[PDB]
């Protein structure tokens with residue numbers, strides 16, 4: 001089991017970390033969602049599907065910088081929605097194929113009443129997502145740490 005980014009940055013068997021740089025909608029109104037769909041940028045696969053079933057959860061998702069200050073976060077993991085920042089580990093998603101499958105993580109961020117102006121700064125860390133991988137074969141318990149950075153400013157009209 002290993003993961004790779006849309007651009008080819010890989011975290012190999014055993015886990016590790018990698019940076020993910022996402023384009024964000026440049027203007028988000030109060031009452032709208034800024035969506036950070038990471039399933040288009042994080043892909044993982046099972047290396048031994050003939051024998052092993054891998055289990056994948058979103059163990060923890062943390063908010064930083066402007067997302068922490070200016071947004072109210074919900075994370076949608078494999079079709080279900082949970083608070084973001086997270087308050088529990090998600091259920092497992094089964095990875096049972098050697099073909100790359102998107103990691104089904106999307107963030108839904110809506111501005112708070114106090115938000116206005118440059119609510120997210122270009123190049124800033126906006127989230128850290130911890131993917132936890134286990135299996136039905138051994139005691140493997142690995143963390144793939146995704147640091148999410150904003151490629152651009154996000155302005156909340158005032």
Ligand SMILES: OC[C@H]1OC[C@@H](O)[C@@H](O)[C@@H]1O
Pocket residue numbers: 001002013014045046047048049052053054134135137140
């Ligand atoms: O993906 C199948 C297996 O690949 C080897 C090792 O990463 C295991 O943890 C994993 O379950």
